[PDB]
Amino acid sequence: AAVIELGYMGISVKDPDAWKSFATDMLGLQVLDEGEKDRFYLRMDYWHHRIVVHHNGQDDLEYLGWRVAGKPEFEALGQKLIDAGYKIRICDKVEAQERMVLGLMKTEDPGGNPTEIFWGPRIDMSNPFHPGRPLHGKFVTGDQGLGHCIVRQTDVAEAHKFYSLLGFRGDVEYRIPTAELSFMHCNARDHSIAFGAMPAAKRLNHLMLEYTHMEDLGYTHQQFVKNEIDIALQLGIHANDKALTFYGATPSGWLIEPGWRGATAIDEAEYYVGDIFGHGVEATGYGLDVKLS
Amino acid sequence: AAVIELGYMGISVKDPDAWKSFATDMLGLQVLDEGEKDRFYLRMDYWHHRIVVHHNGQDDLEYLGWRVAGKPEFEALGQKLIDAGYKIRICDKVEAQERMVLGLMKTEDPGGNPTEIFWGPRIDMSNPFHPGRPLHGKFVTGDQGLGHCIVRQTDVAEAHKFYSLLGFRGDVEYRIPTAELSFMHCNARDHSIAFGAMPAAKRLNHLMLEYTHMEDLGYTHQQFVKNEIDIALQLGIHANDKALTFYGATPSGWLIEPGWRGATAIDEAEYYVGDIFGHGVEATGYGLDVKLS
Amino acid sequence: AAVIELGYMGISVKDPDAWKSFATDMLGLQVLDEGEKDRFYLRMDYWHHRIVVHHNGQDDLEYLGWRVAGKPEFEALGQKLIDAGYKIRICDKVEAQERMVLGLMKTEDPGGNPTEIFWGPRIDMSNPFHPGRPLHGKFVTGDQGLGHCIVRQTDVAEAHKFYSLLGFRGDVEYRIPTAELSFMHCNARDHSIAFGAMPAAKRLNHLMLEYTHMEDLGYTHQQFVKNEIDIALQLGIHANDKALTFYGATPSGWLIEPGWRGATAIDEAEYYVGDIFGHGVEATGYGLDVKLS
Amino acid sequence: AAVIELGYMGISVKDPDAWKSFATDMLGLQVLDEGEKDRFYLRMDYWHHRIVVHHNGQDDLEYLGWRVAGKPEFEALGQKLIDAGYKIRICDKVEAQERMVLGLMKTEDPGGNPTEIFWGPRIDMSNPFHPGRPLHGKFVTGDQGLGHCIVRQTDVAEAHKFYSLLGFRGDVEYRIPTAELSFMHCNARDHSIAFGAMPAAKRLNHLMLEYTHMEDLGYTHQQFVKNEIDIALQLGIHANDKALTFYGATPSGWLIEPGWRGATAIDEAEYYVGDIFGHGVEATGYGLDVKLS
Amino acid sequence: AAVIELGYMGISVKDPDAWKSFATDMLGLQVLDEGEKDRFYLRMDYWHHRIVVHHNGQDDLEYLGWRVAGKPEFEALGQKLIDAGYKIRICDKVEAQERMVLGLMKTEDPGGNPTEIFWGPRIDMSNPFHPGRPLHGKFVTGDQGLGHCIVRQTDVAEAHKFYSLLGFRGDVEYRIPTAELSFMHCNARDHSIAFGAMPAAKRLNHLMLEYTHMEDLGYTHQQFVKNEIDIALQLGIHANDKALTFYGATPSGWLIEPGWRGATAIDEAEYYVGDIFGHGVEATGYGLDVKLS
Amino acid sequence: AAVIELGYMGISVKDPDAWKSFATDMLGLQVLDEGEKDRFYLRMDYWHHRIVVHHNGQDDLEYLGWRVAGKPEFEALGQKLIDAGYKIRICDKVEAQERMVLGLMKTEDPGGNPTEIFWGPRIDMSNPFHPGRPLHGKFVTGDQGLGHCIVRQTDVAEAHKFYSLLGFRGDVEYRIPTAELSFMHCNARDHSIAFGAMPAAKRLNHLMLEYTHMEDLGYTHQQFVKNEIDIALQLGIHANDKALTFYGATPSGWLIEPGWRGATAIDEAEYYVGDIFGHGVEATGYGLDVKLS
Numbered sequence A, B, C, D, E, F: 001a002a003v004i005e006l007g008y009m010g011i012s013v014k015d016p017d018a019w020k021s022f023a024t025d026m027l028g029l030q031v032l033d034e035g036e037k038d039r040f041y042l043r044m045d046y047w048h049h050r051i052v053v054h055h056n057g058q059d060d061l062e063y064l065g066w067r068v069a070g071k072p073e074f075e076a077l078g079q080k081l082i083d084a085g086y087k088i089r090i091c092d093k094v095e096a097q098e099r100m101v102l103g104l105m106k107t108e109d110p111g112g113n114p115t116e117i118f119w120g121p122r123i124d125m126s127n128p129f130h131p132g133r134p135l136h137g138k139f140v141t142g143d144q145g146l147g148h149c150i151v152r153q154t155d156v157a158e159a160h161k162f163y164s165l166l167g168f169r170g171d172v173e174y175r176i177p178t179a180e181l182s183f184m185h186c187n188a189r190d191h192s193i194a195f196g197a198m199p200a201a202k203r204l205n206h207l208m209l210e211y212t213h214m215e216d217l218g219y220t221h222q223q224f225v226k227n228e229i230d231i232a233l234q235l236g237i238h239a240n241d242k243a244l245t246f247y248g249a250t251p252s253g254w255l256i257e258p259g260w261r262g263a264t265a266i267d268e269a270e271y272y273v274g275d276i277f278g279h280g281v282e283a284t285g286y287g288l289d290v291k292l293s
């Protein structure tokens, strides 16, 4: 029994209108508004949603939702967490329905990040993805889940223990002149969660979303430049996942990492002291002032 | 040890002559009459038969025959069922020979549906399938077994427990505005058995048979229309298996679901609130008045 | 730990000169004479040999040599046989060297057939196979071992227990109007050993050797016809392995089954009541007077 | 938990300048000098290095570095070695940093060869391999590690026990008229370590490095001939790995075996009494005066 | 008979030392100096050279060398040019040897650009490409020739007539708000020559060289940024060839266009009014101040 | 209409017994003796023969036999040769039958080498190739014909004109420090005929035969070394065809070039000044004292 993907994430925001325009125009995500007073959804694929956007918010992560294959794996992982001393709560039907899942449990990772484990997402096969702007392609999701994030941790060894229990694999992959960053995978995506020991004002450092087409990544980069949105780290290729990516500001102040061409996760641990090219610092103050080239 | 396919099914009918004409002309199945006073066979492939048609009957399912790989799996599953508290009977040679199998056991699922577990079907490699009408292609069988059915259940959780013990995987896949339907697989066929909590006059709701060719599905649909046979649900594509199918009346009053292009089963649970298109209700009273589009 | 192929076989013969001419001209095997007074070898591939031909003999099987992957599997299987009550003898270096293997043990199957289990065959990569007559192709060996045989058994259930312990899988595959024949596999070859309950004057009923090319099978058949050698069963295709084969007399009186186009073994048990075509009886008295078509 | 590749090796040399010229001109390896007073590095691929060359040395092997997938396998193998009675030392951060690995332990094989087990090599993805002379291709490394070696052993059975514990598989593959040589694999490379019982003045008999291109192997052979460097064994093809190789003197007196076209390791043990062609003795005194053709 | 590739080009430069450092460090080309007083060579592949760099020069193009398949095509094209009224000179052996070709003719295109047509380039298969800095990959050459250029033309219709006679195909592909640019191909490279009506101080506007690997393109871009070399047009993707490219200053003042992922030429004419993304103007004065996004 | 392969060759020899042993043991060719007093045949494949060996001979080439597709191409090429001023003779049935072809014409190339053009070779599909020694593989023939040769020419331009008329393509490919050698192809074999201006005592310089397997080439090389047969040029790889080959003496004094891994012919002319590696001179006096490395 193990987590198999980053299924969904919840964020809260102070400016929902800015977020709708940002998500659609700058990224190509689809806005779905179900008429709820306090939230809307962002789509990437056939799932009803991948991101829940809550308003009256704190401009930060609200929860990560990690999928397991089914009820037997849900029950086994729950018991594993209990046996290891972690505190979990199995949610009732109302709470599961709020997330639009068949089964749901809530806990917190060792860094304080609200963590949900679920099975049975709602897939709207009748409602194909329709991007918020014209796209050459689509997003890479499927068995790789929605993307990845770096989140704050206060104790890297304890974080690693928790994510290992959940079925993730990975360790320190960068020693940057020394800062150490750890990257963990639960499927073919090179990593789904990553972290280090750096102090951080927010739970969320960045969210990476992956395009199928280089043309969409480039156009997104151009949208950031034309609209004069801060780029924290310039275009570059990571040594671990081999993806072409950049990092730009969101209206909430944490970063989005649009990217293209991520490689398959490997179980064999290796480490690097820098990236392949690029990812030079441009705008500062976003929690990623590392020297990568 | 696990069930690996829906190997055969037995039905009983009040009008065997109507069933011969229906099976051959409307569906393209092959009638095999071995001169027995009380039954004949329907073929789909090289197996001696896939369906036994008993006459002097009740116009309903008589038994489902689930295959295991061999004697060791047969013996292991038998003991598993006994240990879990289910009542089984290991059949003698005469009874096994009646079904034309090397080993046979009989039991009943929690909904009262007679359930057989066997190994070693008779394959007539010398006698290739010869359809009851001209076909462009053939049927999809092989590792996927003969097809799938929905059968009546009175306790969904108990049904799920039983089929899980037998090696099936699956859960609720549709929440239709709320009706919940569960679908379970034991091989690459998207599902082989499915059920929900709806009251039903018959054990059998429908049997799905899959053509290799769209042209045969379309011609079958045309045969139903031309002969003015009730179509309960119109052409459409299911969100789970992605197959193009419709549902038509059989002479016994339960439905046949001829189809084409079923997708591979997945172990990762998801659910839907509707189909991709179609499957609108036409004729009523057949136990499937759900809103799928 | 399991047997992985029929590695070699030993036979003894009354007329070694006739056997050399037969093996080369009629079958295309390669004769290798190492100058030993009491034996010579037959080759099929890069192995030093696949068949040892002893002279001053009884015109029957002397031993079957079953390969395991290595020493750990050899030791594990030896202990398994001991624990189950079978009598084995681990051979010393001289005896292992006689067979040209790294490790050797000797036992007897429940029908009295001398049975050897070994690891580490001698492969003469420096000495490519050179057939005893011109061939269009070569033999099918590799992961499938040298071929298959039917051998005499006195207790089918005990035979099955023994071969199952050794890692073989399979059961009754033919019910011929009733005679039952069992076929067991230990690799991709449809079967490597088979048996039934019929009385037999010899340990060996037949040995099947498989050509890569239909042209070589046909030419071999023609050689039997032209030289007026008894054909016991005519050309035909088996329902289990789908191979085109015939059965002809050897100088020792047991049969050779030259063949072509054998299918991959399947773990799922099925049975047949006849072959696909052919295999009609021609010459009688060879222990295979079954009705296969 | 098992060793997955020969990750690195350390050697010590009396003439570092001769080694730089040899490695670059004769073999095409890349010299990397980090300004350390007592060592330099040789590269083959993206790894920071594959060979450490220590100076003020003994012209022999200093250590073999065997990789495991990650920390869990490192910890499991360490405990396995302890439980079996072997003496290991888990290294501190300074020592791990010396080797540029995330975790390191040191021990000695039963023949006295210093043996290191590590996880997390440093990969310089920013610094692609740049050969020390023009090459048509590159080296075969990746999942196959850097190459293979024969090292001295005093007790073959004890050596085999040790490498088996580490996850290697293999046994005697040559009986050369009798000398027995054992070859063990831990990945797809036909073998990564090999040994026999012959007396040897040095720990290291030879190191084999594999080119992707035959043209580079041939040019290397020509470089040895033109520069009048001793060739111990002439061009030939091995019966086990099917590679085209020759053996030439290094400035340290042990042999390099440049090669091309190695086959995939097999778990099924076989043995040979000679090679496919070539590998005739030319220069003597290098510890490989065997008759291979 | 037709031109099949841009085989070589000659340039002349005022600062050969700056060009050596630029070509090697910034681009990864290989410098080959044959000891000639007035020139050196740049390599990209197995050809003896692709670019001749003459010194005591004008910082501009000296000649384009267009390859034909062999002598029959050389002779046919020569006669075609003569028959159409163009002035050509068939070169003697000394002149052909200067270019290291088997046959050579010299002419001038309608814009005054010295144009050479040749067959039989010198290929140094013994001397594999060795880049002037470490590269992840190599260059795209082969059937696509060395790259492409834009050169000055004074009469677009006459230029088109000339290149059409030589076997090129293509027409106006961009109408940029109106400036019209024409692009012509002679092989699978999307184009090998292009031109428009804009006034130009130099014969050569830019030369495009294509990497096999995105990582090398990105590293080259980084080298331009780090060394503060003018980038005329920023990273972007062309609508015609779909390549990712940027344009940077050379020491001669004309531009290099390093790129990656060019698409196959198409014979069906289409046109665009802008690029896919990027190629925004940065540094001005380089003859490409067009609005492409 | 064009020649499509080197179909057969005739040689005459002073020592037929030495030639039988040489061809079989040293090369693996098959000797076929039809009981004719003055000749025997050598086979490589299903053709009745590829080489006719005449005795009472001159130890040189007697004729090259070039195949055309059929009668229409035979008639067209005959008329082409006549129209161009060459002297041909269309052979009668007896003469065609001597060569075992359906149609035959005889002429002489400009260097005096007897040249035959034919259609309709005799293929003995009933008699598969059986090599004169054990082989790992077979020969490369099929659409590539039997091999290639260098033959004497007195006027290279006239030779080129003749072979061009016959449908061959090619030109000078080596300028060896200056000696120029021309190589011409008529199918996918890199070349089938080659020549230069060097004086030669014999019509035939060498015949190249190509193995499918490197192992057979290496074993052949070893046979030459062990039997102390002159090797004129050592193992090496040609820059044009990329084949691994060496050149050894035949009993007739001209050379055989056994080889492996020839590349596909290219229509685009290029030239080289040396080989990739090897082909160093060993034994002299065989008409190939060129410097190739």
Ligand SMILES: Oc1ccc2ccccc2c1O
Pocket: A150, A174, A181, A208, A238, A239, A240, A241, A257, A290
């Ligand atoms: O996705 C990533 C891969 C590698 C990284 C390496 C260092 C910082 C951030 C990184 C990141 O977001």
Ligand SMILES: Oc1ccc2ccccc2c1O
Pocket: B150, B174, B181, B208, B238, B239, B240, B241, B257, B290
């Ligand atoms: O085969 C099926 C797939 C999905 C279904 C969904 C809802 C009702 C029946 C269904 C069915 O027969």
Ligand SMILES: Oc1ccc2ccccc2c1O
Pocket: C150, C174, C181, C208, C238, C239, C240, C241, C257, C290
């Ligand atoms: O190889 C065989 C396959 C099937 C058989 C079925 C019945 C008798 C002999 C058989 C046999 O030798």
Ligand SMILES: Oc1ccc2ccccc2c1O
Pocket: D150, D174, D181, D208, D238, D239, D240, D241, D257, D290
């Ligand atoms: O790599 C090798 C393969 C086989 C061998 C067989 C005998 C000696 C050395 C050998 C070797 O270095």
Ligand SMILES: Oc1ccc2ccccc2c1O
Pocket: E150, E174, E181, E208, E238, E239, E240, E241, E257, E290
């Ligand atoms: O390679 C190119 C493709 C398209 C272009 C379109 C407009 C200007 C330059 C271009 C170029 O160099």
Ligand SMILES: Oc1ccc2ccccc2c1O
Pocket: F150, F174, F181, F208, F238, F239, F240, F241, F257, F290
């Ligand atoms: O087959 C050949 C290819 C290239 C050659 C190049 C120079 C001499 C002989 C050659 C030859 O026999």
Ligand SMILES: [Fe+2]
Pocket: A148, A150, A206, A208, A257
């Ligand atoms: Fe990231």
Ligand SMILES: [Fe+2]
Pocket: B148, B150, B206, B208, B257
């Ligand atoms: Fe259904």
Ligand SMILES: [Fe+2]
Pocket: C148, C150, C206, C208, C257
């Ligand atoms: Fe058989």
Ligand SMILES: [Fe+2]
Pocket: D148, D150, D206, D208, D257
């Ligand atoms: Fe070796």
Ligand SMILES: [Fe+2]
Pocket: E148, E150, E206, E208, E257
């Ligand atoms: Fe361009």
Ligand SMILES: [Fe+2]
Pocket: F148, F150, F206, F208, F257
């Ligand atoms: Fe040649």
Ligand SMILES: [Mg+2]
Pocket: A170, A173, A183, A184, A185, A190, A191, A240, A265, A266
């Ligand atoms: Mg990772």
Ligand SMILES: [Mg+2]
Pocket: B170, B173, B183, B184, B185, B190, B191, B240, B265, B266
């Ligand atoms: Mg399902």
Ligand SMILES: [Mg+2]
Pocket: C170, C173, C183, C184, C185, C190, C191, C240, C265, C266
């Ligand atoms: Mg079987």
Ligand SMILES: [Mg+2]
Pocket: D170, D173, D183, D184, D185, D190, D191, D240, D265, D266
């Ligand atoms: Mg091995």
